[PDB]
Design an enzyme around this catalytic site. Structure first.
Site, PDB file in Angstrom:
ATOM      1  N   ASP A 156      37.186  -9.490  50.632  1.00 46.00           N
ATOM      2  CA  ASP A 156      35.757  -9.274  50.852  1.00 46.00           C
ATOM      3  C   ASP A 156      35.213 -10.605  51.360  1.00 46.00           C
ATOM      4  OD1 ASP A 156      35.529 -10.380  47.808  1.00 46.00           O
ATOM      5  OD2 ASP A 156      33.640 -10.695  48.880  1.00 46.00           O
TER       6      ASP A 156
ATOM      7  N   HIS B  94      30.495  -4.609  65.551  1.00 46.68           N
ATOM      8  CA  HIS B  94      31.697  -5.104  66.198  1.00 46.68           C
ATOM      9  C   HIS B  94      32.547  -5.951  65.264  1.00 46.68           C
ATOM     10  CE1 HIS B  94      34.562  -7.116  68.713  1.00 46.68           C
ATOM     11  NE2 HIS B  94      34.135  -8.251  68.188  1.00 46.68           N
TER      12      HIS B  94
ATOM     13  N   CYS C 124      39.242  -4.584  71.693  1.00 48.89           N
ATOM     14  CA  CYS C 124      38.515  -3.875  70.645  1.00 48.89           C
ATOM     15  C   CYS C 124      38.081  -2.473  71.067  1.00 48.89           C
ATOM     16  CB  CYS C 124      37.289  -4.693  70.232  1.00 48.89           C
ATOM     17  SG  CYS C 124      36.328  -3.973  68.888  1.00 48.89           S
TER      18      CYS C 124
ATOM     19  N   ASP D 118      30.997  -6.840  41.919  1.00 49.99           N
ATOM     20  CA  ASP D 118      31.340  -8.108  41.295  1.00 49.99           C
ATOM     21  C   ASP D 118      30.512  -8.119  40.011  1.00 49.99           C
ATOM     22  OD1 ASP D 118      31.541 -11.604  42.476  1.00 49.99           O
ATOM     23  OD2 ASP D 118      32.312 -10.599  40.684  1.00 49.99           O
ATOM     24  N   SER D 119      30.928  -8.923  39.042  1.00 47.93           N
ATOM     25  CA  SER D 119      30.271  -8.969  37.741  1.00 47.93           C
ATOM     26  C   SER D 119      29.015  -9.820  37.622  1.00 47.93           C
ATOM     27  CB  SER D 119      31.284  -9.430  36.704  1.00 47.93           C
ATOM     28  OG  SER D 119      31.885 -10.639  37.126  1.00 47.93           O
ATOM     29  N   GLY D 120      28.789 -10.692  38.597  1.00 46.54           N
ATOM     30  CA  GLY D 120      27.622 -11.554  38.560  1.00 46.54           C
ATOM     31  C   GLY D 120      27.992 -12.944  38.080  1.00 46.54           C
ATOM     32  N   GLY D 121      29.254 -13.112  37.693  1.00 42.72           N
ATOM     33  CA  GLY D 121      29.726 -14.394  37.205  1.00 42.72           C
ATOM     34  C   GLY D 121      29.724 -15.517  38.225  1.00 42.72           C
ATOM     35  N   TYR D 122      29.406 -15.200  39.475  1.00 40.28           N
ATOM     36  CA  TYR D 122      29.388 -16.219  40.514  1.00 40.28           C
ATOM     37  C   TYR D 122      28.049 -16.308  41.228  1.00 40.28           C
ATOM     38  CZ  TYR D 122      30.930 -19.063  44.486  1.00 40.28           C
ATOM     39  OH  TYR D 122      31.062 -20.060  45.425  1.00 40.28           O
TER      40      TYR D 122
ATOM     41  N   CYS E  87      31.877  -2.363  71.959  1.00 38.04           N
ATOM     42  CA  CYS E  87      32.649  -2.846  73.094  1.00 38.04           C
ATOM     43  C   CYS E  87      32.870  -1.781  74.163  1.00 38.04           C
ATOM     44  CB  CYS E  87      33.981  -3.406  72.603  1.00 38.04           C
ATOM     45  SG  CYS E  87      33.756  -4.921  71.640  1.00 38.04           S
TER      46      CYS E  87
ATOM     47  N   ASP F 176      33.137 -13.173  34.367  1.00 40.68           N
ATOM     48  CA  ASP F 176      33.782 -14.470  34.208  1.00 40.68           C
ATOM     49  C   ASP F 176      32.836 -15.635  34.448  1.00 40.68           C
ATOM     50  OD1 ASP F 176      33.480 -13.894  36.922  1.00 40.68           O
ATOM     51  OD2 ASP F 176      35.224 -15.090  37.491  1.00 40.68           O
TER      52      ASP F 176
ATOM     53  N   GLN G 178      41.589 -17.384  36.686  1.00 39.61           N
ATOM     54  CA  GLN G 178      40.902 -18.637  36.968  1.00 39.61           C
ATOM     55  C   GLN G 178      41.901 -19.771  36.766  1.00 39.61           C
ATOM     56  OE1 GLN G 178      38.109 -19.043  38.353  1.00 39.61           O
ATOM     57  NE2 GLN G 178      37.247 -16.978  38.184  1.00 39.61           N
TER      58      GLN G 178
END
Ligand SMILES: Nc1nc2cc3[nH]cnc3cc2c(=O)[nH]1
Ligand SMILES: Nc1nc2cc3[nH]cnc3cc2c(=O)[nH]1
Ligand SMILES: [Zn+2]
Ligand SMILES: [Zn+2]
Lengths: 367, 367
Positions: free
Chosen positions: B265, B334, B303, B92-96, B308, B141, B188
Site C-alpha cells: 500500500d 493512470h 499502458c 490500518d489500526s491508527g498506530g502510525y 492512455c 501497534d 516491529q
C-alpha cells in the site's frame, strides 16, 4: 449530415422543441450546454458529460486563447481531439469574458493577461474559433454593463452590430469554416425595446444561422429578464434557434422556454455543485448543511443519475466538507444530469402539448 | 466463501504468487492496495478503482474515527456501503497516523484533533475497525521513530507485542468480527535483527491470519529497507501473507516481492498523481514540465489504461498546470492502473518461473 439544419417538430405557445443537425451530431432543443471553459467541464470526463444527456458543450475564446493557446490547440488537432469530446461545441467569442474577468476601441479590445498583452478583434475572434475547430461560432460583440443608460446601451449595441457584420464577413471569407461550422449573431440593447428591435433587425439583415439574446444574466432580476424576453425574442427570426446566453437557474430556463428560447448555458450546475449546492425537484439544497450528515437518501428522490443510484447525501456531505475531489465529481455529475432531465421533461411536454401544465407543476413543487 | 484462506499457487526464490479468499472477494497476491484514507481513493469513483484491477483498498482507523466518525459510519451501514466499495477493505489500526499526523501510555494514546480530545487503545482500535466493517483488521501497534536507538526500538517493539496480544483477544471476544474478518499482526524492531526475531516469534506464538512488516518506509533508504527485509521476512510464518506497510515505489515493490512480500500500500500513486508525477515503464515523468506542452503521446506508450487510450500528455499537462480537477482524476487513474499492471506482470512472471528475469528487465528500462 448537413452543416446546419434547425427543424421545429412541435410548438406550444411561444415554446418550441426540435433539433439542430450538424456534422458532428444532433442537438435536441430546448438544449442545455454544460460549460467547459478551460477545455474541460470541471470534474467530469467527456463520456460522463455525454452520459448525462448533453448533446453539445460550451467553450470560451477568451480563456482558451490565453491557456493553452489557440494556435497550440490547432497544432494539436483541435479542441475536440484535445479534450476528447467529438460532438458539437459552441464557443463564445470572448466579448464578455474580457470585460468581466483592458483598452477598448472600434477595432477590438486589448488586455492584460489576468494570469501578457493580447488583442481581440472581430476578425481575430472568428479566427480563434476556427483554430479551435468550433462548430457553432459566436459573433464578437461588446456587452453592456448593467445597469446601462440609454445612450451607452445604444452605443454598445450599435458597435456590436457593426462587429456582427465584420464577424459575418470574416466567417464567410474562410472557406473551411463557412462550409463546416455555423455562425450565431448576438442581439444587444439592454432592457430597451427600441434598441432590441434595431439590433434584431440589423442581425436579420446580415443573416445568421442562429440568434442569441445577449446582455442578460448580468445582474438583472428574473422579473426584468422575463420582461425583456417577452418583447425581444419575438423580434428574432422564428425559423432559427434562439440562444439565451448565461441563463441556467432551473426556473429561469422553464420561463425562458415559455418565451421562445431554444438554447441555454450556465456555470451554475458545475460551479454550485462544487460549492455544495445540489438541485432537486423540490428545490436546491446545500449538502454541507449538518442536517444531511446521517441522511441515507439520495440527492434527489426521483433523479436517475448514477450518483443518486449509488451514493447517499450523508456520504456526499462528508466528501464536500472534507474537501474531497470525489465530492466535486459526484455533485457535478448529479447537477448536470438534473439539468438534462429538466430539458428532457421540457422537450417531451412540448411535444405532447402539455408544457404549460408542466411549467405550473414544476414551479409548484420546486418552490 | 471462507472467512480467510491464503493459498500459494507458485513460487520462485523467496517470491510467491497466489490468492487470499475472503467473504467479500478474492485478493490476488502479490497485491497493491490503493489508499482511501478519507473513505475515498482520492479523485476516483470506486468502480474506476476496480476497473484498474484493484482487489482490495486500504482504509484508516485514525482518519475515519475523526471524520466522519466510527459510530456514524456504523449507523450508516458500514464503510463498504458508505463509500460504495463492496470488496475487501484492510484498515490500518491508527498506530502510525497519530504519531505521524498526543499523550502516550501503556493503555493507548490520547491526542488533539488535528482538524477535540480522543483516546485510542488496542481495544478501541479493534472496535473501530469492527464498526467500520473492515475485512482485514490490523493489530494496534506503536511505531518506532526513525532512526531509533536499540533501547527505544526494543521498548516500542515490546509494547507492540503486548498490544498485539490485547488486539488478538479483543478481536476474538467479538463473535461477529472473529467469524467474518481477519486479523494481521505487525512485526516491529526497527533495523535490528534480534528485535525483529523476538517480534516475529511473539507474533507467531499469538497467531495471526497475516503478518505485516512495520517500521519501514519511514525515512530509510531502499538499501537499508531491503537489508532489513532480507532477514526479517524469513522470520514470519511462511504459509501466511506478508504485508509491507507503506511501501509503493515501483522498484521498491519489485525488490520487496523478491524478498517474500505479498501485499503493499502507498499513497505515492495517488498523491504523486495529483502532484503531476506519472509512472511509466521508462521511469517517472512530471507532466508539468514544459516539454510536454505539445506532446501528443499518451502518458505511457504501453499502458492499456483508459487515460492512455484517450488523452495526450499535452492535454493532461494543460489540466495539471491549470489546476483542473480532471487533471487529478486522469493522473490518478493512470498511476493506479500502472501499479496494478505492475502487480499483474509480477504475478504472471512468478507463475511462469521468470520473475527474476522480469525484475532485471524492469530495472534496466525503468532506470
Ligand atoms: N458574447 C457574449 N457572451 C455573453 C455571455 C454571458 N453570460 C451571461 N450573460 C452573458 C451575456 C453575453 C453577451 O452578451 N455576449
Ligand atoms: N500500524 C502501522 N502502520 C504503518 C503504516 C506505514 N506507512 C509507512 N510505513 C508504515 C509503518 C506502519 C507501522 O509500523 N504500523
Ligand atoms: Zn442524481
Ligand atoms: Zn495509462
Amino acid at each position: 449530415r448537413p452543416r446546419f439544419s434547425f427543424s421545429i417538430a412541435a410548438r406550444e405557445g411561444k415554446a418550441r422543441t426540435g433539433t439542430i443537425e450538424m456534422k458532428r451530431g444532433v442537438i435536441r432543443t430546448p438544449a442545455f450546454m454544460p460549460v467547459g471553459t478551460a477545455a474541460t467541464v470541471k470534474a467530469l470526463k467527456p463520456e460522463t458529460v455525454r452520459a448525462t444527456g448533453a448533446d453539445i458543450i460550451l467553450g470560451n475564446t477568451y480563456h482558451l486563447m490565453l491557456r493553452p493557446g489557440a494556435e497550440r490547440i490547432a497544432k494539436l488537432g483541435g479542441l475536440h481531439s484535445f479534450m476528447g469530446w467529438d460532438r458539437p461545441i459552441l464557443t463564445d467569442s470572448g466579448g464578455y469574458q474580457v470585460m468581466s474577468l483592458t483598452k477598448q476601441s472600434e477595432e477590438g479590445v486589448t488586455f492584460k493577461s489576468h494570469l501578457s498583452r493580447h488583442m481581440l478583434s472581430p476578425e481575430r475572434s472568428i479566427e480563434i474559433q476556427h483554430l479551435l475547430g468550433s462548430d457553432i461560432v459566436m459573433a464578437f460583440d461588446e456587452c453592456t454593463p448593467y445597469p446601462a443608460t440609454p445612450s451607452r446601451a445604444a452605443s454598445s449595441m450599435e458597435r456590436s452590430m457593426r462587429w456582427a457584420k465584420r464577424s459575418r464577413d470574416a466567417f464567410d471569407s474562410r472557406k473551411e469554416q463557412a462550409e463546416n461550422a455555423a455562425l450565431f449573431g448576438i442581439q444587444q440593447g439592454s432592457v430597451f425595446e427600441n434598441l432590441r428591435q434595431q439590433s434584431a433587425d440589423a442581425l436579420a439583415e446580415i443573416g445568421f444561422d442562429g440568434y442569441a439574446v445577449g446582455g442578460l444574466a448580468v445582474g438583472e432580476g428574473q422579473d426584468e429578464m422575463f420582461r425583456v424576453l417577452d418583447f425581444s425574442v419575438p423580434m428574432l427570426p422564428d425559423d432559427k434557434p434562439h440562444y439565451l446566453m448565461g441563463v441556467g437557474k432551473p426556473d429561469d430556463i422553464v420561463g425562458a422556454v415559455e418565451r421562445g428560447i431554444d438554447m441555454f448555458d450556465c456555470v451554475l450546475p458545475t460551479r454550485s455543485g462544487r460549492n455544495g449546492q445540489a438541485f432537486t425537484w423540490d428545490g436546491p439544497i446545500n449538502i454541507r448543511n449538518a442536517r444531511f450528515s446521517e441522511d441515507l437518501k439520495p440527492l434527489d428522490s426521483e433523479c436517475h443519475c448514477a450518483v443518486c443510484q449509488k451514493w447517499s447525501r450523508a456520504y456526499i456531505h462528508h466528501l464536500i466538507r472534507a474537501g474531497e475531489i470525489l465530492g466535486a465529481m459526484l455533485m457535478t455529475e448529479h447537477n448536470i444530469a438534473f439539468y438534462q432531465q429538466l430539458m428532457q421533461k421540457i422537450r417531451d411536454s412540448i411535444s405532447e402539448g402539455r408544457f404549460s401544465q408542466f411549467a405550473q407543476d414544476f414551479r409548484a413543487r420546486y418552490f
